[PDB]
Design a protein around this ligand. Structure first.
Ligand SMILES: [Ar]
Ligand SMILES: [Ar]
Ligand SMILES: [Ar]
Ligand SMILES: [Ar]
Ligand SMILES: [Ar]
Ligand SMILES: [Ar]
Lengths: 173, 173, 173, 173, 173, 173
């Protein structure tokens, strides 16, 4: 019954709300990853920095979705935020593997929403996703795949040495 | 079994984790309040801005707690984040009343943690709370009490007129 | 019945009001000391300047207490201000002795209020006192003890000569 | 028995001391008015600012009188300072009415002292009053009369609305 | 019999003197650690730099204690300074382990003094410790725990390689 | 068995270590002298400043010796540091007399080491001492002799007056 709402299905509105939840969940995951790498018994500052910056990015993603929801005349609805999947994240390798799984999950959710927008004939949504989300996920996933490759080549017969060098020479300088 | 951990009780560690949850919960509440006031059918930009800035502040509070947890050798543990208490926040008056209830809840939690720190003889915790949290809450609650008073004097026989003027002349310029 | 007031006892509120009175009293004392040293028959400009700056500092102390009273939701209550204890302040030595007695009185009052805050479990008050008052009094009392020592070493067989040199070479340049 | 004192009657000296007391009393009144408008349940920052600036001005008035007293070879004598006439100041209208009563009292005291100076043939006193006091009081009283007029036109069928708008649009920007 | 001394127990005064000795001892230890890593047969400039900066910090700590002792009217008393516990400090790992033991000893001494200040009801001492000492020790110990973790992950099957890389890539750049 | 060590006798190495101890001892003495003159019952800031700057200079002397020890391939060895010879230093005159005794002791130790270097045919040591130590001691002793002369001419029939004037007009401006 919005005065402005036009060509904006209830189905898309609902899916946008679910995606917001997924992005806040991802932000929460990165916050946890960040503080894990900041533990005195883990102490990989560059890895902490990588994940803390991702927490911010995911939060910004959610906020961008919510703004758009309002611009189209939809109603934000928030749900419980489930805690991250792990309390301890193991090695940089383990963490980066978990990060790529997470981003692929987000990406597929974006792709699903794009498909719904296409089916509903909502070119504004499709443009919005294209402009602000799809390329960002692709670039991020490529960068994470890059990191994983480099971590894997390093962590050979001397795993600790490799983990230190990656953090020192690839991450946060 | 931390190498650094010293004079840091398990009781304080647990309470710090609970407080982090409370601050993230509060951040989530403010995010919801913010986007509500950004709805086209509510449209009070200064009120949105007030709450969005509080969402950031509460998040920063949580992150400060987590950093300290790590500095003392404690282990961050994250739990589910419950969604805000309302989906719609009514008038600016209603929102500001809900905001003060929330901040008083946070404040009492800080005071409870201070008391636990005192009982455990943990002067670092007590100083940390004093320095970064207690004064901030007091100042915020005073400002919110100030706003509530002004909202109440305005929303007299002409409520809409008063709500508009408060947003225009007190909030976000 | 304040909307904001939290963990703020009536006992602390009352003691804060008494302390305000003590600080304004002290300001009044310094105003009198200042103008005494400005008399044409006393004429010690550096001593006048020392006390006039203390009058301002004590006033600022009172105003800081009152602001805090409001921040906590207490009610300022003002009482009569008793005039300074002397109309004429004698030598610089006499004045500086009277000044140290006065500051020790203020200091003990601050310490008493801190103890009351501790008993009432009011860590905000305790932090407030610690931050803005306790160190300031200690530094001031040390400086006054320093001055007294130097005045005393000077005012030997030639008291007037010593009083002039102290004012000229230690005070207000 | 002053070396400098010339054409300075004991009557004028005494009256100057009384006037100092009146100006410090007025300063004290404004301090109280200021902190009242800073209460969380009153919260009119521009009104607080108006009165706090008047407290400073009245204090400066007293100090100017005392300096002059010394310049003429008179002796400052301080008396008890009576507390302000009210603990709570009601509306901005009530406060501004009380402020004008107070300033008229000061003004009449200045006029009385001028008349005494004239009778004693003390042109220095008369010039001093003229230069630093009489015009200042006239300008202040006019400004307060201006404010009262505007408050009165505002506080019509909607008193709270009027009090808010006056504070926002006339006072402290 | 000090003119200024107020609320400053003999017990606290004595404990402050002991703590000064402990901090100068620690400074002396770091001086020794520094010059060890500067030996031509050890030659780890970044490790030398880390310890030389700690020697300065500990000295500054002692001087801060002594200044405070004087501010409160206590009397500094100096005792013999015992030489460091080792003449040769082994590996960077060994040194960093010894450094953390030392800082924990200092920290516990600060905590003991805080407890004594609390028992004696000396809020100035408690604030002083809180402000200038407790947080500094916590931050330092965390940083040392961080370093130890990184040293340990490096010094794997190739200890010399790890010691070189840590000095080059973590310390003094 | 050093790789670099050349023309550096064990006798010189040992004497260098003893001299380091003497210079650190002297630093410790000056630290004590400094804080004595900072007592509220002594309060001669310029005298405190003179000795605190000497504490730093002596420390720097020791560190210069240690660096050189390493440059030549010798091994620093640290011993206990004996506390200063007095707990209270009396007048500025007494202190300055004690200071000159101390510096003459250091100077003679430098001269003894130079003689040992000459006997051992160690021109690098002799140059090092000449360059960085011998002239510095001579200049310092001359300055102290200058001060003593001026203190003595002042502290005549009015000792306190003289001590104040020296501190004010010769020392730390
Ligand atoms: Ar993840
Ligand atoms: Ar709320
Ligand atoms: Ar006084
Ligand atoms: Ar008034
Ligand atoms: Ar150590
Ligand atoms: Ar000495």
């Amino acid at each position: 019954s919005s005065q402005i709402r036009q060509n904006y299905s209830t189905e898309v509105e609902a899916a946008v709300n679910r995606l917001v939840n997924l992005y806040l969940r991802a932000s929460y995951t990165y916050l946890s990853l960040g503080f894990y790498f900041d533990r005195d018994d883990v102490a990989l500052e560059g890895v902490c920095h990588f994940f803390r910056e991702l927490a911010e990015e995911k939060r910004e993603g959610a906020e961008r979705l919510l703004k758009m929801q309002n611009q189209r005349g939809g109603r934000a609805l928030f749900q419980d935020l489930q805690k991250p999947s792990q309390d301890e994240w193991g090695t940089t390798l383990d963490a980066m593997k978990a990060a790529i799984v997470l981003e692929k999950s987000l990406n597929q959710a974006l792709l699903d929403l794009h498909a719904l927008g296409s089916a509903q004939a909502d070119p504004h949504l499709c443009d919005f996703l294209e402009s602000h989300f799809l390329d960002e996920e692709v670039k991020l996933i490529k960068k994470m795949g890059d990191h994983l490759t480099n971590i894997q080549r390093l962590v050979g017969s001397q795993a600790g040495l490799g983990e230190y060098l990656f953090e020192r020479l690839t991450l946060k300088h």
